[PDB]
Amino acid sequence: MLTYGAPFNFPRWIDEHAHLLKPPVGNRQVWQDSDFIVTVVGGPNHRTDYHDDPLEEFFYQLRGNAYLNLWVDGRRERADLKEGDIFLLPPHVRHSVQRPEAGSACLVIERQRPAGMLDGFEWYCDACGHLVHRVEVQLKSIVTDLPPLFESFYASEDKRRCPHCGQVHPGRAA
Ligand SMILES: [Fe+2]
Ligand SMILES: [Fe+2]
Numbered sequence: 316m317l318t319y320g321a322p323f324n325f326p327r328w329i330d331e332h333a334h335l336l337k338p339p340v341g342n343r344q345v346w347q348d349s350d351f352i353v354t355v356v357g358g359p360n361h362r363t364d365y366h367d368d369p370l371e372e373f374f375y376q377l378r379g380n381a382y383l384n385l386w387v388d389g390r391r392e393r394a395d396l397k398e399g400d401i402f403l404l405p406p407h408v409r410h411s412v413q414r415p416e417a418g419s420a421c422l423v424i425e426r427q428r429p430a431g432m433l434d435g436f437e438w439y440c441d442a443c444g445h446l447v448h449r450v451e452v453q454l455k456s457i458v459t460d461l462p463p464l465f466e467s468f469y470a471s472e473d474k475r476r477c478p479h480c481g482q483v484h485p486g487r488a489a
Contacts, residue, residue: 319346329355329377329420337417352425358414363489364465365409367435370426372410374402379419384411391444396421409437428454436464438484440477447484448474
């Protein structure tokens, strides 16, 4: 009843999964069907969507650097995950994680969401900073519940059009 296997060396597990910690794939979840979702995230990867997590997110940047674009107190903000940094993100703080560096590796820990506890994914207008669009999801598996969400935002000018100025968000790349 060691459901998740025995202890294993983390530095070598990362090395052996280097090929998955780059595009297209970029991340890799360590254990399946656990309440703690433990993930190593590589790079490079940039993104425009902001995440509204209904629970906390723990970060430990083992290798290389990254940063988070944030909305805090109503203003845009960057928080830097220099190598060796740890960070706890409180629920519902909008965050957009940028990972410019190949060969980087960040341990990210989250919890399964209970039924009815929803995640949100939002884009904002580069022009007027207004909320451009938001999907809420019952997040079960990032691999099938998230890609289609981004794809459908990039494909629809109607979803990218700011409802306050009319600027059509550029979609995938800022
Ligand atoms: Fe997140
Ligand atoms: Fe706008």
